[PDB]
PDB file of C-alpha atoms in Angstrom:
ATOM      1  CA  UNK A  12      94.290 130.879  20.407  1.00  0.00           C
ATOM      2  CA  UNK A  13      93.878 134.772  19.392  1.00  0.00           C
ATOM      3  CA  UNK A  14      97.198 135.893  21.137  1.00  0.00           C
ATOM      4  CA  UNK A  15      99.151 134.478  24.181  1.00  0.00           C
ATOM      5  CA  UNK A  16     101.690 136.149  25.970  1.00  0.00           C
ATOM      6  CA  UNK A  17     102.597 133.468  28.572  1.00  0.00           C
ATOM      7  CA  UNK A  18     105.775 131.122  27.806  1.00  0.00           C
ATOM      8  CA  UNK A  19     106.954 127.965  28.461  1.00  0.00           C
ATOM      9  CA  UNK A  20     109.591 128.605  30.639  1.00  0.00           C
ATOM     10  CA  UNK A  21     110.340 131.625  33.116  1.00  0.00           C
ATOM     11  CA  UNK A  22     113.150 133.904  32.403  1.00  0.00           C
ATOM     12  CA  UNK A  23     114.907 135.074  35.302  1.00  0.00           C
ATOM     13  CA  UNK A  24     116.753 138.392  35.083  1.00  0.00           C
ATOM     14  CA  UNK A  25     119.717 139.639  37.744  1.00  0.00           C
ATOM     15  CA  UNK A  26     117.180 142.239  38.555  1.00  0.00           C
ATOM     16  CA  UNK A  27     114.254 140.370  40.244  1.00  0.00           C
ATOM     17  CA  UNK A  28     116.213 136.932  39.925  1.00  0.00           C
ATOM     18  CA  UNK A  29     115.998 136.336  43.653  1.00  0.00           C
ATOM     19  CA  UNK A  30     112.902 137.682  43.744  1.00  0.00           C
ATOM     20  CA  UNK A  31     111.442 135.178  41.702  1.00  0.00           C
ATOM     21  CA  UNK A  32     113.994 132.130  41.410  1.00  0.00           C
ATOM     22  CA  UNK A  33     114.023 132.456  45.308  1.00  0.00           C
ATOM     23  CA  UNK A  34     110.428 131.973  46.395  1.00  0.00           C
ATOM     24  CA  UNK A  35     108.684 130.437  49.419  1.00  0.00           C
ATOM     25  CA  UNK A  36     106.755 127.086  49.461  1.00  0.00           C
ATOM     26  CA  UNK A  37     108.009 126.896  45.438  1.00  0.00           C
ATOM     27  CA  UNK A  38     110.174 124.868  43.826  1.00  0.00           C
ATOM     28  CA  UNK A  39     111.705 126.808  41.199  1.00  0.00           C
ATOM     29  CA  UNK A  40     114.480 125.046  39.061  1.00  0.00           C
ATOM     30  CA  UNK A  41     116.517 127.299  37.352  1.00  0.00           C
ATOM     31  CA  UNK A  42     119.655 126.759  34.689  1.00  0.00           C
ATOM     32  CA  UNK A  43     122.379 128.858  34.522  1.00  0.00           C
ATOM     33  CA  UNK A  44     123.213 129.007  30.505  1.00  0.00           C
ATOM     34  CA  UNK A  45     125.843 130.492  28.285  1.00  0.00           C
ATOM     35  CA  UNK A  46     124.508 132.119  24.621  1.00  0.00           C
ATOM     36  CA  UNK A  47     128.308 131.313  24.036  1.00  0.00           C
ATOM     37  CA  UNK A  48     128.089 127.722  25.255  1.00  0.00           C
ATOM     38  CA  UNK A  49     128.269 125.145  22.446  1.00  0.00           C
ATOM     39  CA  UNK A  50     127.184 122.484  25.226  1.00  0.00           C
ATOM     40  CA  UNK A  51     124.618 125.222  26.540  1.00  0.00           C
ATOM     41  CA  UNK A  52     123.089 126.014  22.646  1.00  0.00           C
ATOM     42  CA  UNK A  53     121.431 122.481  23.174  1.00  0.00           C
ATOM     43  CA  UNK A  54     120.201 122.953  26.482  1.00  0.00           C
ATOM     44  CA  UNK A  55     118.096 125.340  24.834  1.00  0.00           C
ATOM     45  CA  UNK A  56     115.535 123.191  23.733  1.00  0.00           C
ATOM     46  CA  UNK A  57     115.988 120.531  26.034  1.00  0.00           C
ATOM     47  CA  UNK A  58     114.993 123.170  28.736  1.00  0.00           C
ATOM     48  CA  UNK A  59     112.426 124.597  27.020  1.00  0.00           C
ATOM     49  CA  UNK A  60     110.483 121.265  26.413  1.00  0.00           C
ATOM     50  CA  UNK A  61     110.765 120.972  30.052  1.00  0.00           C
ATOM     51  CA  UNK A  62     109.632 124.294  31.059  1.00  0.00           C
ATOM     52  CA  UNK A  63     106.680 123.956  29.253  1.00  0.00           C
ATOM     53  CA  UNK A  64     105.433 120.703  31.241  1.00  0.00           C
ATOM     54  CA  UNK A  65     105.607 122.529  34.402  1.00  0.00           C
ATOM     55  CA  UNK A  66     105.014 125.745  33.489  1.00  0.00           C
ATOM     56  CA  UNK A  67     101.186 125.783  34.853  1.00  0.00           C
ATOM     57  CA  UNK A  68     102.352 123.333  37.794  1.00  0.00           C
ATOM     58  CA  UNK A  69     101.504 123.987  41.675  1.00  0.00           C
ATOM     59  CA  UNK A  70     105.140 124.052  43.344  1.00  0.00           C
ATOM     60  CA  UNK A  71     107.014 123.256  40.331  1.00  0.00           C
ATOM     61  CA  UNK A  72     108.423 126.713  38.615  1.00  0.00           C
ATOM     62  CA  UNK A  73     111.198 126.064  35.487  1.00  0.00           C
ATOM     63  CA  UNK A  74     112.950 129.514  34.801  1.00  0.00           C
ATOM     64  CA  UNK A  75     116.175 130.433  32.798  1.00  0.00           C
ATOM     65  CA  UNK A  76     118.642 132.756  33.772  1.00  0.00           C
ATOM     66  CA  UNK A  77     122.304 134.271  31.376  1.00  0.00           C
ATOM     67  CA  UNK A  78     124.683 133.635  33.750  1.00  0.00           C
ATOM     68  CA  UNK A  79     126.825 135.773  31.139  1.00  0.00           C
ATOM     69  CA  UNK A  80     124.280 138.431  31.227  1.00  0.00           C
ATOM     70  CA  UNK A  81     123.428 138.006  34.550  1.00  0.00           C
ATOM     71  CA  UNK A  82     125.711 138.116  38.420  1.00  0.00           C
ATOM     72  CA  UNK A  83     124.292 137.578  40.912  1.00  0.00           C
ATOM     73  CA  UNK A  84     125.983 136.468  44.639  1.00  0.00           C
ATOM     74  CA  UNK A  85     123.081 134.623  46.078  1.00  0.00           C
ATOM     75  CA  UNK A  86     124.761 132.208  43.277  1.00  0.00           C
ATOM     76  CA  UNK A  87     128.486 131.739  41.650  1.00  0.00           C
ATOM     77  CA  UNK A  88     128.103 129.813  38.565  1.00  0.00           C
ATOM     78  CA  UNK A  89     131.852 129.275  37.420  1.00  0.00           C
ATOM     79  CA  UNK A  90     130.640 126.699  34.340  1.00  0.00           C
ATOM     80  CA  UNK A  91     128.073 125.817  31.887  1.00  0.00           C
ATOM     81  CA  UNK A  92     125.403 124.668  31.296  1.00  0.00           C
ATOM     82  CA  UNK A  93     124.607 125.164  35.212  1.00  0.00           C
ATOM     83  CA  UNK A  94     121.315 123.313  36.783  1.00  0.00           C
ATOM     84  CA  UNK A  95     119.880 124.510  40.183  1.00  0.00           C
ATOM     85  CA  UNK A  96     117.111 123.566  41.734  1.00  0.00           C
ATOM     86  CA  UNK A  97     115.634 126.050  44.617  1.00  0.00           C
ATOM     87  CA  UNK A  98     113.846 124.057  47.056  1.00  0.00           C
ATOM     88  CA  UNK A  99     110.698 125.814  48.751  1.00  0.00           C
ATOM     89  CA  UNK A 100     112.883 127.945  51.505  1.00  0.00           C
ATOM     90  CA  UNK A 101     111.899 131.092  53.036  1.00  0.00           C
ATOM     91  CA  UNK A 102     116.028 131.429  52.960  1.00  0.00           C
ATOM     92  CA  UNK A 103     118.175 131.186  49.650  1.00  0.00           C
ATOM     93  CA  UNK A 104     119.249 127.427  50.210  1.00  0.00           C
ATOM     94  CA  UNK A 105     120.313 125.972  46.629  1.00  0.00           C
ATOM     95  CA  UNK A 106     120.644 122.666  45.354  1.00  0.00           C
ATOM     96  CA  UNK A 107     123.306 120.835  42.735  1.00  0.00           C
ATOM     97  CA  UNK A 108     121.685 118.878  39.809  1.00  0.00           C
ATOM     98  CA  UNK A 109     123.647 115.763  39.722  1.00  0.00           C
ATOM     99  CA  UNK A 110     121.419 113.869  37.597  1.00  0.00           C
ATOM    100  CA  UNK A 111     121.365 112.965  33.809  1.00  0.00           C
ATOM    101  CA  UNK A 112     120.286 116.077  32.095  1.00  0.00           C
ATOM    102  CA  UNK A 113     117.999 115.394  30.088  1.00  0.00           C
ATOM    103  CA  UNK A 114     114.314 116.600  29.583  1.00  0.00           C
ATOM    104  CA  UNK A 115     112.800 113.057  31.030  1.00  0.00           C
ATOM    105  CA  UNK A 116     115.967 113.371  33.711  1.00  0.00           C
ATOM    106  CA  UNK A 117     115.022 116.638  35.001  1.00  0.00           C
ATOM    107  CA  UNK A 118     111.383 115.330  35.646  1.00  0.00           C
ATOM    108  CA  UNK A 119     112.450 112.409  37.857  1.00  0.00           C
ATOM    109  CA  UNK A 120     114.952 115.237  39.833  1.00  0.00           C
ATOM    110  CA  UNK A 121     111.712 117.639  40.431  1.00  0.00           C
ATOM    111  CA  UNK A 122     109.160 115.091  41.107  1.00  0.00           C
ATOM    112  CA  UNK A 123     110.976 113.671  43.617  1.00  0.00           C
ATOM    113  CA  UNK A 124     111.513 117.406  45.185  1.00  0.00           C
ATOM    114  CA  UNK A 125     114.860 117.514  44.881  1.00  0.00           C
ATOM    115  CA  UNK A 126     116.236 114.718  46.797  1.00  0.00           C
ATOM    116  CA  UNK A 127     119.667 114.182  46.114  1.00  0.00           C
ATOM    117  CA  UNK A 128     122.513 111.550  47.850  1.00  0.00           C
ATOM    118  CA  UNK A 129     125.697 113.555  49.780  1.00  0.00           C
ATOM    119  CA  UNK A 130     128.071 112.959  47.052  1.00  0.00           C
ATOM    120  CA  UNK A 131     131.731 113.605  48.255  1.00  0.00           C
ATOM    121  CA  UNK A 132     133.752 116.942  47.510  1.00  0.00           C
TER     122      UNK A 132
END
């Protein structure tokens, strides 16, 4: 390796986050963190370990996005650390992580293709 540019994970930006979080026949998971965040500061690396494993995937996308740096109504994240998984939709559906996590977690939520149970509200 001379010099790579490439990273491990996608970093979404308020500017073109729709235009790249939200994209057709792709599932791109993104996560909503806080650089203030204690809980967040850890996700860091978690998310990043993940990122990389499906970073050169077919349908599977990671990507970050600041919340705190970044509004955007197409999404209201009023928390942190903040999972959401965009299922391949021409529209801007969005889906709730309710699983464990963790880097091995986040697998078993994306190779399934985002199937999660109605939970009650």
């Amino acid at each position: 390796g001379s010099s790579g540019s490439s990273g491990p994970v996608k970093v979404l930006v308020g500017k073109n986050f729709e235009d790249v979080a939200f994209d057709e026949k792709k599932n791109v998971f993104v996560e909503f963190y806080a650089p203030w965040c204690g809980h967040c500061k850890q996700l860091a690396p978690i998310w990043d370990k993940l990122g990389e494993t499906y970073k050169d995937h077919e349908n599977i996308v990671i990507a970050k996005m600041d919340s705190t740096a970044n509004e955007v109504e197409a999404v209201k994240v009023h928390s942190f650390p903040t999972l959401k998984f965009f299922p391949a939709s021409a529209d801007r559906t969005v889906i709730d992580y309710n699983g464990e996590r963790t880097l091995d977690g986040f697998k078993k939520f994306l190779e399934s293709g985002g199937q999660s149970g109605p939970s009650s509200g």
